[PDB]
Amino acid sequence: LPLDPLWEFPRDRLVLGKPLGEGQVVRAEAFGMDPARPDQASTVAVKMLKASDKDLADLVSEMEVMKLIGRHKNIINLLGVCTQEGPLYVIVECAAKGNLREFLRARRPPRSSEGPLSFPVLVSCAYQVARGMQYLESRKCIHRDLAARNVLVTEDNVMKIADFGLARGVHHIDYYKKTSNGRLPVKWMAPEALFDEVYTHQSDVWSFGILLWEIFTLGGSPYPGIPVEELFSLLREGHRMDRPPHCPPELYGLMRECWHAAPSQRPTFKQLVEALDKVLLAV
């Protein structure tokens, strides 16, 4: 691997800590990530191999994607890399509150009538994800698995889209795959992706609609009670999820637009940002 001085960070300035998931991602302390404060500690996340040569190329691929995509408030940003004299590390921002799905589920409801989550904050979460996706789209990045579990939450409740630069094996998806936390990722796939193996930014818009439903069910799992075999047949029939409880029609409206059969008849991310902004400003 060649040295890129723009991004190289000394590995001896990292102290590896608790693993965050399984390549693998590990929480770490970094010293002098800002070269103006060389002895200052910060908390970062380090992506690394668990590994085959294919596994290595995929991580290098993600690294190069992240270099090109540039900075945005609502994505997990690249901070540095360690490529020389040791294992490949890709250092990115660490979001203190974990993923959005778990953030919502943990916060389900003199203030006994009040849970931690209010309507304007739920809308803000949706707006921020749309802003991040608008940015990624402007950089010609299709996410391909946009979902609440792939949005991370900072200490200040800022949404950051994660894992947007993954080499995903799109031509070998096990549609019946259930994760160790019980997720069926097929439930986020646009029909053109699932059925025809076509991905565009409009397929991410479909997934955003599913994410919207996750937000307004406070981390509910989509298509409740529906196994994959039934999901296939239901999608072929044009099945859409019901309006969740305590969800205004404006937001279910947006969900249904995101799930229009024709990709060109779904909103763009720019339109979603504008629509959600209007709801946010309506108080």
UniProtKB/Swiss-Prot annotation:
Active-site annotation: D145 (proton acceptor)
Domain Protein kinase, residue spans: 14-283
Entry superkingdom: Eukaryota
Post-translational events: N-glycosylated. Full maturation of the glycan chains in the Golgi is essential for high affinity interaction with FGF19.
Annotated positions of the Phosphotyrosine modification: Y175, Y176
Tissue specificity of this protein: Expressed in gastrointestinal epithelial cells, pancreas, and gastric and pancreatic cancer cell lines.
Cell compartments where the protein resides: Cell membrane; Endosome; Endoplasmic reticulum
Cytoplasmic-facing ranges: 1-283
Family statement drawn from the similarity comment of this UniProt entry: Belongs to the protein kinase superfamily. Tyr protein kinase family. Fibroblast growth factor receptor subfamily.
Disease: FGFR4 variants may be involved in the pathogenesis of various cancers. It has been found in prostate cancer as well as cancers of the breast, colon, head and neck, larynx, lung, skin.
Subunit structure: Monomer. Homodimer after ligand binding. Interacts with FGF1, FGF2, FGF4, FGF6, FGF8, FGF9, FGF16, FGF17, FGF18, FGF19, FGF21 and FGF23 (in vitro). Binding affinity for FGF family members is enhanced by interactions between FGFs and heparan sulfate proteoglycans. Interacts with KLB; this strongly increases the affinity for FGF19 and FGF23. Affinity for FGF19 is strongly increased by KLB and sulfated glycosaminoglycans.
Name of the molecule in the record: Fibroblast growth factor receptor 4
Lineage of source species: Eukaryota, Metazoa, Chordata, Craniata, Vertebrata
Residue numbers of the full-length protein present here: 454 to 750 of 802
